[PDB]
Amino acid sequence: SGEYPTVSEIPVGEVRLYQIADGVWSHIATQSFDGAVYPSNGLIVRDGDELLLIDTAWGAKNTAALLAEIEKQIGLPVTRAVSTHFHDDRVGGVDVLRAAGVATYASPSTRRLAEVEGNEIPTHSLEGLSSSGDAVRFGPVELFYPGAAHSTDNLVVYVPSASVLYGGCAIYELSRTSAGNVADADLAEWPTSIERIQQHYPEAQFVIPGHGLPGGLDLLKHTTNVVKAH
Numbered sequence: 001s002g003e004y005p006t007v008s009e010i011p012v013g014e015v016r017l018y019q020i021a022d023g024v025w026s027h028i029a030t031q032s033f034d035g036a037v038y039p040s041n042g043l044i045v046r047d048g049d050e051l052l053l054i055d056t057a058w059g060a061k062n063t064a065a066l067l068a069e070i071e072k073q074i075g076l077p078v079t080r081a082v083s084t085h086f087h088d089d090r091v092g093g094v095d096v097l098r099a100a101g102v103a104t105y106a107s108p109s110t111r112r113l114a115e116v117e118g119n120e121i122p123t124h125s126l127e128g129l130s131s132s133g134d135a136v137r138f139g140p141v142e143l144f145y146p147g148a149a150h151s152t153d154n155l156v157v158y159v160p161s162a163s164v165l166y167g168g169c170a171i172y173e174l175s176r177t178s179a180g181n182v183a184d185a186d187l188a189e190w191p192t193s194i195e196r197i198q199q200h201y202p203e204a205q206f207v208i209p210g211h212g213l214p215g216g217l218d219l220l221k222h223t224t225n226v227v228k229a230h
């Protein structure tokens with residue numbers, strides 16, 4: 001689109017917000033990994049006079065900057081956060097959120113896996129997400145467990161008001177042509193998990209990957225192509 005913030009535009013420690021729809025934003029941060037710097041996305045969704053945060057900004061410092069940018073640009077309190085899998089780009093900063101008064105949530109699986117990794121652990125457990133195809137409402141969003149993909153615990157998030165599908169790290173941006181980290185993945189199941197995402201959200205209008213530029217439902221087929229080419 002030419003409007004979305006890119007990795008080179010954001011120094012590590014800064015956070016950008018991108019308005020997607022009425023009461024729906026993405027947050028974009030950057031972090032060092034494997035000798036390079038990469039971007040990472042999360043989501044912010046308005047719920048009346050409060051905000052729901054989806055995912056941290058990949059570390060304590062970035063997450064503090066995220067909260068500052070939210071206060072500056074939106075001016076509504078973040079009351080709850082959901083982490084969509086156990087990796088540091090999703091949970092790193094949970095301790096900062098807790099210290100800011102945010103109630104943090106993740107599935108039982110995500111909480112267990114974060115503990116095993118030595119990552120920060122979201123406090124509260126999400127009910128009703130244990131089996132592939134499970135969906136639950138959580139304030140202004142639906143949470144969906146599509147099955148194992150990028151990780152065994154990965155969730156996706158849908159915002160019905162705007163037909164926004166937040167795929168998280170189970171969905172790759174269009175420009176990515178090779179697999180990312182796969183030690184936690186289920187490459188055999190990933191294409192089927194993507195089929196379940198599309199079956200549940202076949203009218204999604206905007207699809208946000210965990211890293212990089214948003215797209216449409218074409219990102220699902222693209223991700224399958226990448227996973228199967230690997």
Ligand SMILES: O=C(O)[C@@H]1CS[C@H]2CS[C@H](CS)N21
Binds near residue numbers: 086087117181
């Ligand atoms: O954060 C993690 O749990 C793990 C540890 S090793 C490395 C692989 S993917 C993710 C970085 S986004 N990561």
Ligand SMILES: O=C(O)[C@@H]1CS[C@H]2CS[C@H](CS)N21
Binds near residue numbers: 033089150181182211
């Ligand atoms: O493993 C991944 O899918 C993603 C996308 S590419 C690779 C580098 S940035 C981020 C850190 S976990 N990552």
Ligand SMILES: [Zn+2]
Binds near residue numbers: 085151169
């Ligand atoms: Zn991940």
Ligand SMILES: [Zn+2]
Binds near residue numbers: 040087089211
């Ligand atoms: Zn990620």
